[PDB]
Design a protein around this ligand. Structure first.
Ligand SMILES: [Zn+2]
Lengths: 151, 58
C-alpha cells in the first residue's frame, strides 16, 4: 500500500509499505529516497510522535494515510528564551553550542544582532565563549533575553 | 487522543502549557486555552514548579 509523508519544506514523499512495517522500516525507506539518517527523523500521525518499534497497523495507519516528518538534530534539545517584550521563543540547540552560537540562533528567529543580546540564566549573565554544558543548561531550560537598544 | 494544542505546522498535539511545539519549535496558537483540569506529567509539572519558584522571593 501507499502512504505519503509531508515535510515542512512542502514536499511529499510517497512510500510503498505494508501494514506490518515498523516505524524503523519506514524511516529507512525515507533514507533510501532522501538520504536523511533515521536518527534525524521524527514521524507524526494522529497528533503523536511515532515509536520506532511499533508498526503502521499499531497506529491504525491505512492506505493513503499522510504522516508528517520533522527533522531534528541527533543529540539536540529544546530551550525556551523568554523576552521582556512579550514573546517566549523556542530554540533547538546542542549542549556543545557556545553562547555565541545560541545568540546566532536568536538572531535568525528574532533579528537581533548578538552584540545587542544579553542572555541570563539562573540570575547569571552568560559569556559568549562558554557552552550550554558549562552552565549546565538542560532540556527545556528557560533563558532570559534582554535587548540592548541604543539611544 | 492526547489533550493539548495541535501544531498547525506539523500536527503534533502539544502539552497545553508548552510555549512552542515539542517537534518543530513553532509558537503556540494565540487563542488555545488550557483544560479546566490539566494534570501535567511529572516532568512538565516539575518544569512549571521551577518557573514559579524562580518568580518568587521568600
Ligand atoms: Zn510542530
Amino acid at each position: 500500500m501507499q502512504i505519503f509523508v509531508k515535510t515542512l519544506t512542502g514536499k511529499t514523499i510517497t512510500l510503498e509499505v505494508e501494514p506490518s512495517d515498523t516505524i524503523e522500516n519506514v524511516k529507512a525507506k525515507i533514507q533510501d529516497k532522501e538520504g536523511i539518517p533515521p536518527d534525524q527523523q521524527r514521524l507524526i500521525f494522529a497528533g503523536k510522535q511515532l515509536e520506532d518499534g511499533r508498526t503502521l497497523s499499531d497506529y491504525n495507519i491505512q492506505k493513503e494515510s499522510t504522516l508528517h516528518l520533522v527533522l531534528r538534530l541527533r543529540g539536540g534539545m529544546q530551550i525556551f528564551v523568554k523576552t521582556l517584550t512579550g514573546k517566549t521563543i523556542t530554540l533547538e540547540v546542542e549542549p556543545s553550542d557556545t553562547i555565541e552560537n545560541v545568540k546566532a540562533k536568536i538572531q535568525d528567529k528574532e533579528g537581533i544582532p548578538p552584540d545587542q543580546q544579553r542572555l541570563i540564566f539562573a540570575g547569571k549573565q552568560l559569556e559568549d565563549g562558554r557552552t550550554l554544558s558549562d552552565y549546565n543548561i538542560q532540556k527545556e531550560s528557560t533563558l532570559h533575553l534582554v535587548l540592548r537598544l541604543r539611544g | 487522543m492526547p489533550v493539548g494544542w495541535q501544531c498547525p505546522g506539523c500536527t503534533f498535539i502539544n502539552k497545553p502549557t508548552r510555549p512552542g511545539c515539542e517537534m518543530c519549535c513553532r509558537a503556540r496558537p494565540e487563542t488555545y486555552q488550557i483544560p479546566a483540569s490539566y494534570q501535567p506529567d511529572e516532568e512538565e509539572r516539575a518544569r512549571l514548579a521551577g518557573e514559579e519558584e524562580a518568580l518568587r522571593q521568600y
